[PDB]
RNA sequence: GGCGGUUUUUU
């Protein structure tokens, strides 16, 4: 549903880097150069975001109120 | 002094509800309504 | 409830009333819509349909240099069967 | 639900001893020294200095159960030296060799730092 | 029948991750630095979470989880805090842990990024990593939702949880070159040269070797960023020199006792 | 035109579109 | 929910990832699975042998 | 058309156009004996030994004949096809987020998992199963081999690590209703705390624990055998009410309280438990390779590869070639190359492109073994394996069977009415039963006073 | 009954719980768990000894 | 009652007393769910009142 | 008292299809909530560890437990009356450990051999003298196995890969390829360890065990030689993948010339049999005939195949391991997966025409070609083609449909045997005698 | 005397299960029949029906 | 026991395996491959 | 391929040839034995045999 | 102190 905080195998940060991740897409760069533009050598970090779903939209989409 | 407050359905707006009395929101008129975190000591371990 | 209302009544005036309070409404939607999606909520679909229009060339691409490169195909796990 | 906590892997309990002795009856000195809440790392670098030893004719650790923490390590020395100083002094030898290291480590980095 | 005398020599230190090289030691010695480094290593680290309003998606654990993997710097604070446990007091006292505030609530249309920085906290030096590069997403918050609570962070270590694990990834590799042949190809050619790999391009592995033994243990340590890297050596080196010292104490008195 | 060997990619086109223009349960 | 855009559909706290196609009786979703049998209309001819018949033809 | 059919969205393109200019056709099950149907256009087409040259139709994709579960399957044309169908009714089973407006729904029995990610290696036909935006399971690093042990029968060793960061966490959901009627003339049902005083019928559990109203608060603690709801019957009062059934344990989400149909007062009570990741918890891969947590390593005792990667699964080898679930083995092989790379691969059942030779060619241009395998330490004490073990990336799921839903015990709890014996079910505070199977393996052991005991001391004593 | 109720019955002082691997343990043990055997209880006659 | 764990491994946890005794007593852990037995000396009542009500 | 370490406690899963199925254990708590037990003890009860459940007993009385205690206890009922062999065996990765073990070229430093032997709670506290003194102390597997062993056990076994025509010729009491197992004393001479020494079978090591030593003896020798084999492979390390699923191309080669040729060969058979040359064999008609030259000439096809992979197969194969230990796999596996799958029959014949006059819409009428009719010719490792994907998909249907059938029918046939003599027994006077005391031997089986 | 189980409570364990379930079938045979000719596979089945999901008890 | 656990394992013309068991066990008046070896 | 010990089989045998007529194993076969009814309702046709 | 039925799942 959001980002993790770390990689579940290694253990690096890796919530701060889905914005950049998304901004680094958008821009040119694909996502094998994006990653390790990001700085993610090993391959175990990089399923956090190649991955990641991100279902936190869908559940804002119902907002209470208003 | 706890008239017991709830949260309408459809309005988020609170509500007043006591015992012997419709389920019902102020205004509009829904038949839904949550009710309130409680006060305790909601507590956890970031574990 | 406003098309209901428009599809029951049969009058031209209160059908084309119904039409333009329920275009109004959605109009007042799509804003409020686009005014909370303004960010994270459009920049990620607008990266989904680039990176799928991306994948489609990226895939294009693909299919048309595995048509050019025919010089020889001879592998070992692969098969295919042959009758007659 | 039975979950055990997440302190019970190093933390002591009200009674249970740290390291425990026992002697064998099977050969000559010989001694089990029984730890309570410890891994390999306190057990593999001990064994290891054990067996860099010379007199020491046996030095091993095992884990009796992982989910147990625990570990016991059998020594056997020669007639004229005991197992008991036999793991002091490996500890004590150990202890002086991180700390050489640490020295080292430090120095060496102080020293990469602009130097 | 002594110990023996290891050197040092590094060769890549940085403020991310620290590469060095340990020659004239064991590898069981080794084996055990890189398990202290992974797990018996003092850090800071959320641990005693109080919510008084989430009205977020998430659940009301899910912030206290994300909140526990955020890490917090802990240069020269981890040394002198206590464990809350060991603590000789009530109530999570400053002196044995850190306080932190979360108050945030969405009133723009836009939604909202409640990330690491909103983490008030009440020490100077105790802070998320965001001193010197995006923030922790905690959670997103739309118009109407909100989220109050207040953590204490205490010191620990990642046999605990993962929460106080600061090193990333600990890479430790010894005999680059297949010499004392404990990893036995099936085919040498078909595998890659390490990264330390002194061997030409021509040979696959090192021929054997009989009377050799392992030395030369690289190590890369990888910080999260919580402890530097060569903080959390030298914190390790500590922690393991301790637990020696307190093992030596008690095989004395159980042997005075016998 | 004939679309030769260029196939593995206009295949899932059609089936794209049929699934765009019929649901899963659109039997029901 | 005939054709609704996946804006109403949320606001009616739905989503669009919904299949539908199933029953809401007394609030539980009920769905009915198809059942097969014989095609109608159509004359079969079968060889039971533990009977007295030979062939028999069914419509 | 195929051009003007990927120019479609933008304009008003759709299979009707290709119905209707007369491309496709649809054929049922009884006209499909009539037609030379054809399994690829290019390949069955160009001039061989005449086999048949007169081919009437053509299929679309040969994987199609998949089904809906089956279609999420990996390679399954690598497999056999037991495992492809085990795979299929577990696929059902498996965890994550079941619907996007979950925390609206009042269902019983929900789990949702916590951070469920897409497969690194999607077939062709889930992006319309919408598998990719509603996952059910993470992507592991897992490694085939036998490390300590207890992962020798179908079993798997996690990563404790990875479980405290959040692997394969989940949320469960327990739902409880009640409402009041009209019993009787004079019986008649309330909301309200039943004291300590008017209320003759009553449990000895606490009562405080909710408010006046009669409903528990949302975010309160509450354990087996607590109670939930204030329902009193007047007779001078019996309590009426319902209590969390025991082994339960969990939080209050959210309290909902309507009038149903009759009119009368209705609520709705949801408690939610994260389930952490504990041994005895039923995983599966996407190829039938069940099993279940057997011990949890830490990170430090995990073995690593070269580099700071621990895996965070160990199944069984021995599970690999009896089971013949090559698909599995290509998958990791593919997964650790699209890792490695930066995006989704294909897994489409029938391609002719996705050999294991070219994707091995890829994997050696990245520092790994073409095949796969790698170079391990003994997390313990550091040692090379001297064993290559074959470890990469491979997407697993998390069945709702949990540990601590199957669980129980018993000593002389509740008694049936009809045969005085212990009664059934785990909800219901049950005994097992002692099938006649048992009798006749003890009459053949020979242990007569064991069967005695078993079918009456602790069965149903009665003079 | 006969088949449901007399030569088939019910049992109190029974658990059942799902299996795991556990090489440690002799052939002859059994790896309990802590709920399990807190619940269960056996009857035991006192004597000075 | 709502308690809080003042001194042992528990410290800083947060529960109701399920069952009390002369010296120990069960104490219900708000996190984890699992209930446990702490001795009473080392519980600490933190209690939950709510001022006003006007 | 709640139930403490050391009680007595009857283990059992729900279908006790034998005695040795509901036998004894002493009580051991754990942390973690699931039941346990050593693997050895999972052929009995036939569990698998795979979310399986098992029901656990508690008796309420000391005469009830004591009478437990002497019967039904796992050491026990080691050997099973039906077939007067082991029920319990290393028939785990601790049998493919222990193979790779106990060949010849295993060694192993004072280091591994004093961390091994301290898994061994039958040691008498002494090391053994190594096999090799200089240039370095270097043990042996089968030296440190030899341990093991309680008492002085003998006896003599067959490895798996033990060239038949090799007792003939020379080298008989000294295999080249370490084969022949001879224990003397309790120490392991010669030959490597697999399912015919250790697992389930007349005569074998631990059957000898068992009929020697005693049931605690042997309790105790499966015990070790698990948490040594164990704490071994936790150094050697054992995996599989495709590195071992890969053949030697000259492999291929070879495979897709016995395809070719089986499928002119058969080509050639139907060319007789529409020429009408092909005379009915003695016994059976045209067709049957017909049939049954196409399926020889396709199992020929196929044992050749797997014959030429297997012959190709090198020592570091981790499926070639599996197979020769015994642990899991056979070679039909292997040549299943890397070579070709094979046909896909179902009611004991070739797939039907289920169509008029043809298998699917895209083969043709009259096709009774090897891949019409349902010759897988792909393997697991290089894909399946979708018609034959379809046809193993209709292959494993049977088979589960068998299963199925078996387990309903199996039922009501052994509830029928049991009732018919559930009241046999032997008595006093050496006799066997039902319920009415009517001689049924005047001596238990003769 | 009318048949059982036609209409069945949507299994919402998961999105995959939701979709199956609304789109499964199920014969009329009898429960458990000694006869093995309607379980098995026809080739028949082929584009029309999933070829390997199904259960795997007595169904 | 012994003669009913095979019975689980176990499966010109013999009809070997449970349909032969069955027909054994119960001493029926017509087999369903009778046959003399002369 | 399976083994069995010759016990089993010939106790089975005798069970079945012990009142010279072949008993069946099936109810038909075991209940017209004069054990009794409690043993044969056990089995098969309970109301009846009671 | 609470029942019958059906369905679905698991070994
Ligand atoms: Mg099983
Ligand atoms: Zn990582
Ligand atoms: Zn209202
Ligand atoms: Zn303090």
Redesign the pocket.
């Known amino acids: 549903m959001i980002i993790p905080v770390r990689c579940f195998t290694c253990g690096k940060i890796v919530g701060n880097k889905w914005e950049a991740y998304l901004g680094l897409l958008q821009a040119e760069y694909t996502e094998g150069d994006a990653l390790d533009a990001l700085g993610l050598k090993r391959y175990c970090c990089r399923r956090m975001l190649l991955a990641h779903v991100d279902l936190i939209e869908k559940l804002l989409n119902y907002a209470p109120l208003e | 002094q706890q008239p017991m407050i709830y949260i309408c359905g459809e309005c988020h707006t609170e509500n007043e509800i006591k015992s012997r009395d419709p389920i019902r929101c102020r205004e509009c008129g829904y038949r839904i309504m949550y009710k309130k975190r409680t006060k305790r000591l909601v507590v956890f371990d970031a574990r | 409830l406003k098309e209901k209302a428009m599809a029951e009544d049969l009058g031209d005036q209160d059908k084309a009333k119904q039409i333009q309070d329920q275009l109004n409404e959605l109009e007042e939607r799509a804003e409020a819509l686009d005014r909370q999606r303004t960010k994270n909520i459009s920049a990620i679909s607008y990266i989904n349909q680039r990176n799928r229009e991306w994948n489609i060339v990226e895939s294009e691409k693909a299919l048309v240099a595995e048509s050019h490169n025919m010089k020889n195909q001879q592998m070992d796990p692969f098969t295919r069967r042959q009758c007659k | 639900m039975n979950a055990p906590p997440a302190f019970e892997s190093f933390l002591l309990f009200e009674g249970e001893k740290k390291i425990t002795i026992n002697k064998d009856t099977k050969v000559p000195n010989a001694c089990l020294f029984t730890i309570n809440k410890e891994d390999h790392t306190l057990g593999n670098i001990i064994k290891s200095q054990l067996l860099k030893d010379p007199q020491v004719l046996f030095a091993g650790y095992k884990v009796p159960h992982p989910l147990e923490h625990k570990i016991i390590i059998r020594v056997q020395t020669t007639p004229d030296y005991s197992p008991q100083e036999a793991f002091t002094n490996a500890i004590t030898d150990l202890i002086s060799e991180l700390s050489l290291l640490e020295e080292r480590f430090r120095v060496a980095i102080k020293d990469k730092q602009e130097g | 029948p002594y110990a023996n005398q290891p050197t040092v020599r590094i060769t890549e230190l940085t403020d991310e991750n620290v590469k060095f090289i340990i020659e004239n030691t064991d590898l069981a010695v080794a084996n055990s630095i890189r398990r202290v480094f992974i797990a018996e290593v003092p850090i800071i680290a959320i641990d005693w979470v109080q919510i008084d309003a989430n009205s977020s998606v998430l659940h009301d654990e899910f912030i206290a989880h994300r909140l526990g993997l955020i890490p917090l710097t802990s240069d020269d604070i981890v040394d002198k805090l206590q464990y809350s446990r060991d603590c000789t007091c009530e109530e999570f006292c400053p002196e044995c842990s850190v306080e932190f505030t979360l108050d945030v609530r969405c009133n723009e249309d836009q939604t909202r990024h409640v990330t690491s920085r909103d983490l008030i906290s009440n020490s100077p030096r105790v802070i998320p990593v965001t001193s010197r590069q995006d923030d922790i997403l905690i959670v997103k918050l739309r118009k109407g939702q909100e989220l109050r609570l207040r953590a204490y962070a205490k010191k620990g270590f990642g046999k605990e949880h993962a929460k106080w694990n600061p090193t990333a990834g600990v890479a430790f590799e010894y005999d680059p070159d297949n010499a004392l042949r404990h990893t036995v190809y099936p085919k040498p050619e078909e595998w890659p040269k390490s990264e330390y790999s002194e061997l030409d391009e021509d040979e696959s592995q090192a021929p054997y070797d009989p009377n050799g033994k392992p030395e030369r243990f690289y190590y890369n340590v990888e910080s999260c960023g919580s402890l530097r890297p060569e903080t959390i050596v030298l914190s390790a080196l500590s922690g393991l020199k301790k637990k020696l010292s307190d093992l030596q104490t008690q095989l004395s008195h159980e042997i005075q006792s016998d | 035109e004939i679309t030769p060997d260029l196939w593995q990619e206009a295949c899932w086109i059609v089936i794209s579109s049929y699934f765009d223009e019929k649901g899963l349960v659109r039997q029901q | 929910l005939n054709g609704l855009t996946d804006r109403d559909l949320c606001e009616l706290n739905e989503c669009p990832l919904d299949p539908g196609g199933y029953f809401i009786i007394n609030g539980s979703e009920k769905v009915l699975?198809a059942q097969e049998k014989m095609a109608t209309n159509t004359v079969y001819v079968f060889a039971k042998k533990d009977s007295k018949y030979a062939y028999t033809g069914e419509c | 058309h195929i051009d003007q059919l990927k120019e479609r969205e933008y304009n008003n393109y759709s299979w009707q156009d290709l119905v209707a200019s007369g491309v496709v056709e649809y054929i049922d099950t009884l006209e499909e004996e009539t037609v030379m149907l054809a399994m690829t256009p290019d390949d069955l087409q160009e001039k061989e030994v005449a086999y048949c040259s007169t081919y009437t139709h053509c299929e679309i994709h040969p994987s199609m004949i998949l089904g809906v579960c089956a279609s999420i399957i990996p390679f399954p044309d690598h497999n056999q096809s037991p495992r492809n169908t085990?795979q299929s009714?577990?696929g059902?089973?498996a965890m994550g987020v079941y619907i996007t407006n979950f925390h609206v729904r009042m269902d019983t029995l929900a789990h949702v998992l916590y951070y469920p990610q897409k497969p690194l290696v999607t077939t062709r036909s889930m992006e319309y199963l919408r598998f990719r935006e509603l996952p059910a399971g993470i992507n592991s690093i897992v490694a085939i081999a036998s490390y300590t042990g207890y992962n020798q029968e179908d079993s798997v060793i996690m990563n404790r690590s990875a479980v405290d960061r959040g692997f394969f966490r989940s949320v469960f959901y327990r739902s409880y209703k009640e409402q009041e009627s009209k019993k009787g003339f004079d019986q008649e049902e309330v909301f309200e705390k039943p004291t300590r005083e008017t209320c003759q019928?009553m449990?000895h559990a606490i009562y405080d624990k909710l408010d006046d109203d009669g409903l528990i608060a949302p975010g309160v603690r509450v354990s087996g055998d607590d109670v939930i709801i204030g329902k009193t019957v007047t007779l001078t009062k019996?309590d009426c009410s319902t209590?969390l059934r025991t082994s339960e344990t969990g939080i209050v989400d959210q309290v909902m309280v309507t009038l149903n149909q009759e009119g009368y007062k209705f609520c709705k009570i949801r408690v939610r438990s994260v389930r952490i990741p504990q041994i005895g918890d039923?995983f599966a891969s996407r190829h039938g390779q069940?099993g279940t947590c057997g011990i949890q390593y830490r990170q430090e005792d995990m073995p690593f590869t070269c580099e700071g990667i621990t895996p965070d699964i160990i199944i069984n080898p021995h599970a690999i070639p009896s089971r013949m679930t090559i698909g599995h083995l290509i998958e990791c092989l593919q997964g650790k190359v699209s890792a490695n790379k930066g995006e989704i691969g294909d897994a489409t059942p029938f391609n002719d492109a996705v050999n294991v030779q070219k994707i091995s060619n890829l994997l050696s241009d990245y520092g790994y073994h073409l095949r796969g395998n790698e170079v391990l330490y003994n997390g313990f004490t550091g040692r090379k394996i001297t064993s290559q073990i074959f470890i990469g990336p491979t997407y697993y799921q998390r069945?709702?069977?949990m540990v601590d839903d199957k669980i129980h015990s018993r000593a002389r709890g509740?008694?049936?009415?009809?045969n005085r014996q212990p009664?059934e079910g785990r909800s219901?505070d049950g005994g097992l039963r002692f099938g006649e199977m048992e009798r006749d393996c003890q009459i053949a052991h020979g242990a007569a006073q064991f069967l005695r005991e078993r079918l009456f001391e602790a069965s149903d004593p009665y003079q | 009954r006969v088949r449901g109720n007399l030569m088939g019955k019910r049992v109190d002082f029974s658990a059942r719980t799902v299996i795991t691997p556990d090489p440690n343990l002799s052939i002859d043990q059994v790896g309990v768990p802590r709920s399990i055997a807190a619940n269960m209880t056996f009857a035991e006659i006192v004597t000075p000894f | 009652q709502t308690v809080r764990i003042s001194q042992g491994p528990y410290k800083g946890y947060i529960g109701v007393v399920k069952d009390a005794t002369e010296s120990t007593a069960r104490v219900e852990l708000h996190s984890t769910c699992q209930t446990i037995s702490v001795d009473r000396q080392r519980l600490t009542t933190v209690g939950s009142r709510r001022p006003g009500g006007m | 008292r709640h139930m403490c370490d050391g009680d007595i406690v009857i283990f059992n899963?729900?279908?006790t299809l034998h005695k040795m199925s509901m036998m004894g254990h002493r009580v051991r708590i754990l942390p973690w909530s699931t039941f346990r037990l050593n693997l050895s003890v999972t052929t009995p009860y036939?569990?698998?560890f795979?979310?399986?459940?098992m029901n656990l007993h508690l008796p309420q009385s000391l005469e009830t437990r004591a009478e437990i205690q002497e019967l039904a206890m796992v050491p026990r009922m080691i050997v099973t009356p039906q077939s007067n062999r082991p029920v319990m065996g290393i028939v785990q990765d601790t049998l493919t450990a222990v193979r790779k073990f106990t060949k010849r070229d295993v060694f192993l430093e004072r280091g591994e051999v004093m961390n091994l032997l301290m898994f061994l709670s039958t040691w008498d506290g002494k090391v053994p003298q190594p096999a090799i003194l200089k240039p370095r102390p270097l043990w042996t597997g089968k030296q440190i196995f030899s341990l093991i062993i309680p008492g002085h056990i003998n006896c003599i076994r067959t490895h798996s890969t033990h060239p038949d025509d090799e007792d003939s010729g020379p080298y008989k009491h000294i295999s080249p390829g370490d084969t022949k197992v001879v224990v003397e004393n309790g120490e392991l001479i010669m030959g490597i360890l697999c399912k015919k020494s250790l697992g389930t079978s007349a005569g074998s090591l631990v059957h000898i065990s068992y009929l020697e030593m005693g049931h605690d003896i042997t309790r105790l020798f499966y015990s070790n030689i698990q948490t040594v084999i164990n704490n071994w492979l936790l150094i050697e390390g054992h995996t599989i993948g495709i590195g071992d699923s890969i053949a030697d191309s000259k492999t291929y080669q070879d495979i897709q010339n016995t395809i070719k040729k089986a499928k002119q060969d058969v080509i050639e058979v139907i060319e007789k049999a529409h020429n009408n040359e092909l005379e009915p064999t003695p016994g059976n008609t045209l067709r049957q005939t017909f049939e049954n030259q196409v399926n020889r000439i396709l199992n020929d096809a196929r044992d050749k195949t797997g014959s030429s992979a297997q012959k190709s197969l090198s020592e570091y194969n981790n499926f070639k391991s599996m197979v020769v230990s015994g642990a899991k796999g056979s070679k039909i596996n292997i040549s299943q997966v890397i070579a070709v799958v094979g046909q896909q029959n179902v009611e004991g014949k070739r797939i039907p025409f289920g169509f008029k006059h043809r298998t699917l819409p895209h083969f043709i009428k009259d096709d009774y070609g090897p891949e019409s009719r349902g010759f897988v010719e792909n393997s697991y490792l290089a894909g399946l083609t979708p018609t034959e994907f379809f046809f193993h998909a209709m292959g494993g249907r049977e088979g589960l449909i068998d299963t199925a059938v078996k387990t309903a029918e199996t039922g009501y046939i052994q509830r029928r045997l049991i009732k018919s003599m559930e009241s046999v027994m032997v008595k006093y006077d050496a006799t066997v005698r039902n319920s009415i005391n009517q001689v049924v031997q005047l001596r238990y089986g003769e | 005397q009318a048949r059982?189980?036609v209409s069945?409570?949507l299994?919402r364990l998961t999105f995959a299960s939701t979709l199956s379930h609304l789109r499964r079938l199920?014969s009329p045979i009898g429960?458990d029949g000694k006869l093995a000719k309607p379980r098995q596979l026809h080739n028949t089945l082929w584009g029309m029906v999933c070829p390997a999901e199904t259960?795997?008890?007595?169904? | 026991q012994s003669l009913g656990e095979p019975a689980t394992q176990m499966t010109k013309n013999v009809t070997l395996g449970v349909p032969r068991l069955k027909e054994l066990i119960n001493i029926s008046k017509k087999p369903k491959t009778p046959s003399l070896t002369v | 391929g399976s083994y069995v010990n010759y016990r089993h089989l010939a106790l089975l045998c005798d069970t079945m040839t012990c009142r010279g007529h072949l008993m069946a194993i099936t109810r038909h076969g075991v209940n017209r034995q004069d054990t009794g009814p409690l043993m044969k309702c056990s089995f098969e046709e309970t109301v009846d045999v009671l």
């Open positions: 699975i | 085990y009714a577990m059902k089973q019928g449990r019996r209590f039923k069940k069945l709702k069977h509740p008694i049936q009415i009809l009664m219901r | 899963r729900q279908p036939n569990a698998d795979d979310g399986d459940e | 059982a189980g069945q409570v299994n199920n429960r259960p795997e008890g007595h169904a």
